[PDB]
Amino acid sequence: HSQERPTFYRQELNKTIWEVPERYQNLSPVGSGAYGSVCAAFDTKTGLRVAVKKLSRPFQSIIHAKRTYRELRLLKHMKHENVIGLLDVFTPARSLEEFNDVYLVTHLMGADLNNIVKCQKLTDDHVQFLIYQILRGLKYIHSADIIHRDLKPSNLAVNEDCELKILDFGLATRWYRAPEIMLNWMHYNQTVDIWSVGCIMAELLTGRTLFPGTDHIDQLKLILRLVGTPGAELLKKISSESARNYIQSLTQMPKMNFANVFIGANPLAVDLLEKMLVLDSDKRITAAQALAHAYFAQYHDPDDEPVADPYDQSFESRDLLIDEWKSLTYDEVISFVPPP
Ligand SMILES: C[S@@](=O)c1ccc(-c2nc(-c3ccc(F)cc3)c(-c3ccncc3)[nH]2)cc1
Ligand SMILES: CCCCCCCCO[C@@H]1O[C@H](CO)[C@@H](O)[C@H](O)[C@H]1O
Numbered sequence: 001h002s003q004e005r006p007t008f009y010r011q012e013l014n015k016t017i018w019e020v021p022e023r024y025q026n027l028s029p030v031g032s033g034a035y036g037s038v039c040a041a042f043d044t045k046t047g048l049r050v051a052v053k054k055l056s057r058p059f060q061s062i063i064h065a066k067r068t069y070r071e072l073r074l075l076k077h078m079k080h081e082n083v084i085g086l087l088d089v090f091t092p093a094r095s096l097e098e099f100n101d102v103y104l105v106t107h108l109m110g111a112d113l114n115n116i117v118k119c120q121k122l123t124d125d126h127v128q129f130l131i132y133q134i135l136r137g138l139k140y141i142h143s144a145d146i147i148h149r150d151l152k153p154s155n156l157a158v159n160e161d162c163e164l165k166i167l168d169f170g171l172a173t174r175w176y177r178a179p180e181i182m183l184n185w186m187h188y189n190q191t192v193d194i195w196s197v198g199c200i201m202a203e204l205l206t207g208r209t210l211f212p213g214t215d216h217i218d219q220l221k222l223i224l225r226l227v228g229t230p231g232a233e234l235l236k237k238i239s240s241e242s243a244r245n246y247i248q249s250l251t252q253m254p255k256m257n258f259a260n261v262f263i264g265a266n267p268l269a270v271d272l273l274e275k276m277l278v279l280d281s282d283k284r285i286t287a288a289q290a291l292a293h294a295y296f297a298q299y300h301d302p303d304d305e306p307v308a309d310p311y312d313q314s315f316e317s318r319d320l321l322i323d324e325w326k327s328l329t330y331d332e333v334i335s336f337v338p339p340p
Contacts, residue, residue, distance in 0.1 A: 005094070006021035006023065006090075007022050008020060008021055008022065011027060013027055013037070014029050014032045014037035016054070018039070018052075018054055019092040019101070020041075020090070020092075020103065021090060023043055023044050023045040024041040024042070024043055024050065024105070025044055026040075027040070027041050027052070028040045028041070030051065035055070036053055036055040037053070037054055037056070038051050039054075040108050043087070043088075043105070046087070048087070048108075050087060050088075050105050050106065050107060050108050051105070051107070051108045052103055052105050053104045053105075054101060054102075054103050055071075055102045055103075059100070059322060059326045061322065062320070062321065062322050065322050065326055066315075066325050068102060068329055069315065069328055069332070070315070072329055072332050073315070073332065074146075075089075076332060076336065077144065077309070077311050078140075078141075079308075079339065080136075080140040080306065080308070081136075081137075081165075082133045082134070082136045082137030082140070082164055082166060083140055083141060084106055084157075084165050084166065084167050084168075085106065085339065086104065086106060086336070087107065087338065087339065088105035088336075088338060089103065089105065090103050090105075091103065091330075096326075099326065102329065102333065109157040109159075109165065109171055110159075111157065111159065111171070112156055112157060112158065112171045113153035113156040113157075113164075113200070115158075116158045116162065117153070117204060119207060120207050121205065121207040124205070124265070124266045126162070126204075127201060127204045127269065128295060128296060128298065128299060129162060129299060130204060131197065131201050132291070132296050132300070133163070133164040134164060134197055135197065135287045135290050135296075136305055137164070138151075138166070138194075138197070138287040139287040139288050139291060139305055139307065140306060140308050141166065141193075142193070142286075143308045144308035144310075145311060146311065146313075147188055147190050147192055148166065148168065148192075148196075149193070150168075150176075150196075151166070151176060151193050151196035151197065152173070152176040152196065152200070153176070153200060155167045155168060155169065155170060157171065174213070174216075175209055175211055175212055175213065177195075177196065177219075178191075178192035178193075178196065178281065179195070179220060179279065180192065182216060182220065183220075183243075188281075189281040189282065189284075190286070190287075191284035191286065193287070194276050194284045194285060194286065194290070195276065195277065195281075195284065198273055198276030198277040199211065199277075201269070201272070201273060201276070202262070202273060205265050206262065206265075211223055211226075224253060224279075225253060226255075226256050226277070227256075227278065227279050228254050228279070229247070229250050229251075229252055230247050230279060230280075233280065234280045235247060235248070237282075258273055258274045266295070268295040269295055271293075271294075271295070272285070272290065272293050272295045275293075291305055315328075
């Protein structure tokens with residue numbers, strides 16, 4: 001109605017003074033790093049357990065300030081059940097002149113896909129549900145012209161109703177990366193993330209990491225052994241002469257028979273894996289196409305797989321001063337409207 005600034009309180013946490021609205025109670029540290037620090041809390045207003053992140057050094061430099069702005073813009077835009085979103089953002093500052101600290105609030109997440117899966121085979125029905133949610137989230141992320149680029153089990157939050165959210169941080173590190181990402185290709189397709197989904201899905205089905213490379217080259221050797229050496233269609237799109245001549249020099253390997261590799265799996269799962277784990281990124285199934293695949297028939301609802309509002313990322317190409325990034329960040333804090 002009902003206008004005021006909330007009443008704040010102060011408490012010493014993770015070696016600094018935290019100043020938060022009184023709705024957030026029982027702060028308990030959960031982690032600290034270069035980035036800032038996170039406390040778990042109880043939001044008495046919503047009845048939700050939340051995580052409150054206080055950014056470290058948000059405006060220390062142009063690059064810090066642009067990163068802070070980027071993070072707030074992204075979190076503000078992401079409004080989807082299977083993607084991290086923003087419950088609240090606040091500052092104790094009462095003016096731009098006072099503005100120094102940024103706090104971000106989201107649902108408390110205590111378990112990632114590894115924490116829940118624990119290296120065991122999941123049932124096919126359970127794999128359908130988890131992969132469906134990842135693809136549902138990716139459809140939304142991709143529709144905002146965003147590519148995750150490092151999707152992996154540690155970036156997937158899952159609760160005890162195995163409801164899943166895609167994150168861009170963690171609560172082995174390269175095993176799920178697209179081969180073009182490990183070769184610093186640039187010009188990435190959104191299907192870089194589909195490769196990662198194939199890697200994750202394979203592992204949930206078999207209980208084994210698909211490409212557990214020891215290092216960069218080994219990872220690539222494991223990939224080529226499964227999917228085969230590049231065909232002529234792929235080779236004609238490689239602009240680098242050294243890349244082409246190295247690839248041609250490799251002994252021709254056929255794509256393995258996925259039906260035999262994943263013997264025992266639902267043949268629809270095998271079919272989907274064959275469509276995700278394709279070396280040529282142009283020939284990989286998209287998130288929207290994958291959601292329509294027969295494997296997900298029990299979960300697919302074409303009227304409840306939403307896309308994002310257009311996401312203005314023009315700021316990415318701007319070179320601005322610190323105070324400008326800071327003011328733009330301040331604007332976004334003030335304009336925040338919580339979800340219903
Ligand atoms: C860069 S790495 O050190 C790093 C690790 C974790 C985090 C990190 N950021 C958050 C986090 C918290 C609130 C937000 F609004 C947004 C992100 C969490 C979080 C969210 C929910 N439950 C538990 C923890 N973890 C950030 C950076
Ligand atoms: C020997 C290992 C070869 C790896 C080949 C990876 C091929 C990835 O696929 C390529 O991705 C590019 C986007 O990044 C596109 O521009 C290309 O058209 C596409 O073919």
